[PDB]
Design a binder for this molecule. Sequence first.
Ligand code: MG
Ligand code: MG
Ligand code: MG
Ligand code: MG
Ligand code: MG
Ligand code: MG
Ligand code: MG
Ligand code: MG
Ligand code: MG
Ligand code: MG
Ligand code: MG
Ligand code: MG
Ligand code: MG
Ligand code: MG
Ligand code: MG
Ligand code: MG
Ligand code: MG
Ligand code: MG
Ligand code: MG
Ligand code: MG
Ligand code: MG
Ligand code: MG
Ligand code: MG
Ligand code: MG
Ligand code: MG
Ligand code: MG
Ligand code: MG
Ligand code: MG
Ligand code: MG
Ligand code: MG
Ligand code: MG
Ligand code: MG
Ligand code: ZN
Lengths: 52, 159, 187, 103
Amino acid sequence: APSRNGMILKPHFHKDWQRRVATWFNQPARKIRRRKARQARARRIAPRPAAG
Amino acid sequence: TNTKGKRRGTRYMFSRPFRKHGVVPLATYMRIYKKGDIVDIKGMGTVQKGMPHKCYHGKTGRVYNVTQHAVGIVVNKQVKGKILAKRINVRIEHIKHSKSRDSFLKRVKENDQKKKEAKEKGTWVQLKRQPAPPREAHFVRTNGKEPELLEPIPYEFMA
Amino acid sequence: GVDIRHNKDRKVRRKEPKSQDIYLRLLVKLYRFLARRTNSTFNQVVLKRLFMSRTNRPPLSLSRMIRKMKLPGRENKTAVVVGTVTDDVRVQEVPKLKVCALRVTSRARSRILKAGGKILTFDQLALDSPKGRGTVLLSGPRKGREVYRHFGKAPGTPHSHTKPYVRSKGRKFERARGRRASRGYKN
Amino acid sequence: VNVPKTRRTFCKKCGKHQPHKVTQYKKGKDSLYAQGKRRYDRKQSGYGGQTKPIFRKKAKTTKKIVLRLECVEPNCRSKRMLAIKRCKHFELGGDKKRKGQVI
RNA sequence: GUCUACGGCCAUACCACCCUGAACGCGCCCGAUCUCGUCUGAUCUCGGAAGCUAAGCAGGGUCGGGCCUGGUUAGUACUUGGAUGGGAGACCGCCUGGGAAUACCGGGUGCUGUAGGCUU
RNA sequence: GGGGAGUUUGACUGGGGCGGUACACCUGUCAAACGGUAACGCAGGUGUCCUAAGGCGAGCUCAGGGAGGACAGAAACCUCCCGUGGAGCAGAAGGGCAAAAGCUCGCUUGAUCUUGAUUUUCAGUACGAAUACAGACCGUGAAAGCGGGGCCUCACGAUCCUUCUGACCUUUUGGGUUUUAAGCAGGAGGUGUCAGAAAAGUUACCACAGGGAUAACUGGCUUGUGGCGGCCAAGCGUUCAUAGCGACGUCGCUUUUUGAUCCUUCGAUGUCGGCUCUUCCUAUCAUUGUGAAGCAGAAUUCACCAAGCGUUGGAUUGUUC
RNA sequence: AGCCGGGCGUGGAAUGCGAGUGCCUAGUGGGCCACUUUUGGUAAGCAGAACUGGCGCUGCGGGAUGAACCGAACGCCGGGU
RNA sequence: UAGUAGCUGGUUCCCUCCAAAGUUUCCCUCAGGAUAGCUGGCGCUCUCGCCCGCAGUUUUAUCCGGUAAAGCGAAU
RNA sequence: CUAACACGUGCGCGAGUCGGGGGCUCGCACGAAAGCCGCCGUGGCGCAAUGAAGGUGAAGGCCGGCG
Ligand SMILES: [Mg+2]
Ligand SMILES: [Mg+2]
Ligand SMILES: [Mg+2]
Ligand SMILES: [Mg+2]
Ligand SMILES: [Mg+2]
Ligand SMILES: [Mg+2]
Ligand SMILES: [Mg+2]
Ligand SMILES: [Mg+2]
Ligand SMILES: [Mg+2]
Ligand SMILES: [Mg+2]
Ligand SMILES: [Mg+2]
Ligand SMILES: [Mg+2]
Ligand SMILES: [Mg+2]
Ligand SMILES: [Mg+2]
Ligand SMILES: [Mg+2]
Ligand SMILES: [Mg+2]
Ligand SMILES: [Mg+2]
Ligand SMILES: [Mg+2]
Ligand SMILES: [Mg+2]
Ligand SMILES: [Mg+2]
Ligand SMILES: [Mg+2]
Ligand SMILES: [Mg+2]
Ligand SMILES: [Mg+2]
Ligand SMILES: [Mg+2]
Ligand SMILES: [Mg+2]
Ligand SMILES: [Mg+2]
Ligand SMILES: [Mg+2]
Ligand SMILES: [Mg+2]
Ligand SMILES: [Mg+2]
Ligand SMILES: [Mg+2]
Ligand SMILES: [Mg+2]
Ligand SMILES: [Mg+2]
Ligand SMILES: [Zn+2]
């Protein structure tokens, strides 16, 4: 029920949103893995540009 | 519950006085209202145009706008726990100059005049209206006639 | 039994800053002493404004300060503001001013120093003028915050130019029923 | 009520009082391709039955009838809608009545 | 003393009957070509000046009606606030303040503004 | 197309239901001399009507009564006099109105286009209604003026959708033309449960969450109704108001009748009778002791102290009766 | 009518008292009783209103007892009344 | 599926200060909500140690009313 | 507890502000932390509103030159 004064809100939480939740606790590990793969490819292509 | 009609319960308030029906005297039409006069409201049922609502009957307001036939006036109305100064338009028949202000104006002129006077004389004069003071001592002279006795009268039935 | 009411018995004004930093509290000590051992009320006003909160100490712009100090009579006096002096970019000519404030924007300080004025802090102000003679006490626009556009007489009510709370501005957001004579009513 | 077939009244296009021929406005035929109608059949098509409400609790026995006015000036011939209060029986310019005759 | 034109307050000015009106005025009054309108020049409109205060109108009168203003009714009726007052109740008394209205008995019977006359 | 599916089956409310609408409005009263103020309080009205019954101007005065005039009369038409409204103004009521707001004529369409402000219910929001203006086009009158509906107080309707009207109007998405469609502004078509859902029943086969906010027992307050008892004394009693009664009145008592209410109890106080058994009341049927009779005796009445002791056996009916 | 400029302070009744203003906001939206006024009802510890004060939210002295009556409202103690 | 419940029941330490409402309007609204009202908290702008204002009060002026009473030799 | 919003408070910077995503730092006890990027500010919020839309889009006041 509306209080005295405020904004009308439409939260989009009428589905089973708690089953589909993407936590980001693997973000630093993902960054580390991407780095390691990047340096591995850079070593693999010996004199070639690393960027491509 | 009651009815919300605009003229409910006004059969005596908006009626005309006894032996005073008929043509409105023209002096009411021939008065001048300027901006800022204190004025009284008294609904007259003879004319129905521009009749004020019954809740302003007997109220005193201040003129803020003058128009061909009517006058706009600011008047206070007590609504529940608050008072609103609201402005209404009333035709000139239902209106009348308030004499509560002219007394104060005349008093202002008169005490200003007596303040201007005696300023050179240096004497003291009272201007503030003091309340009715207690009666001072005096003598009551009997003229040789003694006051007469007063006694209650005996009970005796009339009806 | 005494026929009294205790509703408004306790006054709500601030006795001390709600902040916890130490520099402001040292300033408060100094100006407390100055206010209670000096008859000048400038110290009292400054101490009271030191007590106040952030939203009650709005920033003062360079344009405002120069505008209020260019008025006749107040030449070569020190402009005192208890807030923050922020730079105004839509002003080219800046005179030399003697400013005192708790904190000054870097660009504003550069502008004043280049123009030739000097920046003072409330400490050195105490040393220069304990009772504060030759001071022009200014303040930023307190009603400048946008929250004040939502306050007052409610919208959707005649003769009320109050901003509503809308999540997005557009033609589909609070424009149809109470805002048009064509659809229902117009307030 | 009785209303004459001619009325000298204001004309928006002419910007002056002009004679007007008046008739009774009747509702036009509902186009099949209005946006509301198209949305209505799009929603009704398929399964689920009736979707929008059907009003049934009629209560009023009359309706405000509207006069269609037309400026008689051939160059202008602009038209305007004018409506007056409700009436059970209504006629246009019939048997202009007269007073003090035999009942 | 007073009238006419326009009024203000709208009976202290109205209503009924009776008496008196110098001068001006207001009227009644005499006619229907024109203006105008009617069944009818009765009304209205128009053109006049033989006669008259008869009427209107003005002033005055009535142990007049009414109206206006006082006394009486009356500190009665009613009523603000108070009591661990009375009474089975209905109601009543007191304290603190305010305070009416008929019947009945007196007095009065238009004031006045602007402009213009008459009383040479 | 109830074979089957989903769903609904208003509210108010001296329990609910039936009844009614007090559910949207208006008049008088209640209402306690500003305003506001309740009940299924009282008396009533509304969902319309009007090309004039709107707007001006002019001229007349109404209801009723008295006195007269061929048919003519109680009432047909004409004349005079009186006539403060006792008539009329569409409707309920109230207010208002006399060279008018009434009656009769003349001319008209201010019942038209448009932006704002204000009042009424009010939250001081809408709708509805209304009030002063202002800007154009007009009507009427010689004119001053008056008029943007009805003398005032009531006669009415959001969003979404549809329909009509308006502009050398905007968009119709890569550009251009034309149909079409969508916009902008103003009306209409509703929601009367009238601030506006699209809606039939039954359940004793029933279920759940609750409710003593609410019914069906008792108990409380009340006592109209029931029952019982007084005072007055018209009359009855052959004569005689009061041996015994007692009209027309009027004052009470009781809670063994019924009502009225809804205070307790709905996480339950086992809801008719009969059988059995005890105790209590007296408003006494009998017995003990008395007083009065229209008490000769017998029998029988009325009254007093008085509840100690008794107040049965059966047919019919579930019965209380 | 609005503008400017100028002159007037005995601050023009009594009494009392600091005042104005802005945000955010919980609970509540079953009430009951009493003097007086008052509607329905035969009446009711009934039903319905107006004003004020109470109870609810509140203990204390008194009315033997008691939500509302009379007195009086409250920090822990001594004395007095 | 820990389905929904405007409906019952429960809802855990101390002291200090302030302190209510059962009323208005709308709602298929009447055991519930929204909105005013009543509350608290946070402040802020000034003030006195000549003067400003305000008031559940009085006084002096001035208007407003149709109840109590009274009247029917005044209207209905 | 998460998300959104409103308001009040504390801190930094301030017409700007914010690396949250990514990358560079010999990856790695703590460290999945911390530091840095600035030609990684893309971007968000703010700095301009109004209109349905086509669109438009935020002062002026005095003297000399033909009251
Ligand atoms: Mg809440
Ligand atoms: Mg104390
Ligand atoms: Mg407080
Ligand atoms: Mg199909
Ligand atoms: Mg003649
Ligand atoms: Mg004469
Ligand atoms: Mg004569
Ligand atoms: Mg007389
Ligand atoms: Mg004269
Ligand atoms: Mg002579
Ligand atoms: Mg079925
Ligand atoms: Mg009153
Ligand atoms: Mg006339
Ligand atoms: Mg006009
Ligand atoms: Mg009429
Ligand atoms: Mg069966
Ligand atoms: Mg109960
Ligand atoms: Mg006999
Ligand atoms: Mg038992
Ligand atoms: Mg049991
Ligand atoms: Mg006995
Ligand atoms: Mg009660
Ligand atoms: Mg309290
Ligand atoms: Mg108490
Ligand atoms: Mg006792
Ligand atoms: Mg003691
Ligand atoms: Mg749970
Ligand atoms: Mg409920
Ligand atoms: Mg409950
Ligand atoms: Mg009355
Ligand atoms: Mg009476
Ligand atoms: Mg909030
Ligand atoms: Zn035209």
